[PDB]
């Protein structure tokens, strides 16, 4: 409102979306670790070697998305700081 009024609000929406993306990222991670818990029960005690390799690979990509969206959120807060 104080550093360009009508546009700064038209920029809170963007910050809004960035927070939503982070929250979603953190939820997708927990979701993936719940899914791992169920996958292991399905195996009825057989080796989970292959499940662990898949989880490791998938978790690394989920962690890359999280960092990228965290980076973007920091950069947006910084501008808002002095619209």
């Amino acid at each position: 409102t104080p550093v360009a009024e009508e546009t700064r609000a038209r920029l809170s929406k963007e910050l809004q979306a960035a927070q939503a993306r982070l929250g979603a990222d953190m939820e997708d991670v927990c979701g993936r670790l719940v899914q791992y818990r169920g996958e292991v029960q399905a195996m009825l005690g057989q080796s989970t070697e292959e499940l662990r390799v898949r989880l490791a690979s998938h978790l690394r990509k989920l962690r890359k998305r999280l960092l990228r969206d965290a980076d973007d959120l920091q950069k947006r807060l910084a501008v808002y700081q002095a619209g």
């Binding site: 409102t1 910050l15 670790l33 292991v40 999280l66 807060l77 700081q81």
Partner: protein, 64 residues
């Protein structure tokens, strides 16, 4: 774009991030705690603290 600050919300996200890097290792202790809900319980608590601190920060930011 260069570096950021030491804000309460960045420290919270820090702890979430360090916890997840430990999980990534899939060590024996990670495997134990994954088959319980212990890991998802600890991550949910860290997630909630991050979003709580983030709301608070944006609120005080609008004062400037």
């Amino acid at each position: 774009t260069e570096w950021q600050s030491g804000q309460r919300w960045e420290l919270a996200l820090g702890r979430f991030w360090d916890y997840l890097r430990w999980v990534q290792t899939l060590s024996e202790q990670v495997q134990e705690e994954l088959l319980s809900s212990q890991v998802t319980q600890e991550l949910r608590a860290l997630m909630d603290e991050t979003m709580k601190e983030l709301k608070a920060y944006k609120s005080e930011l609008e004062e400037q």
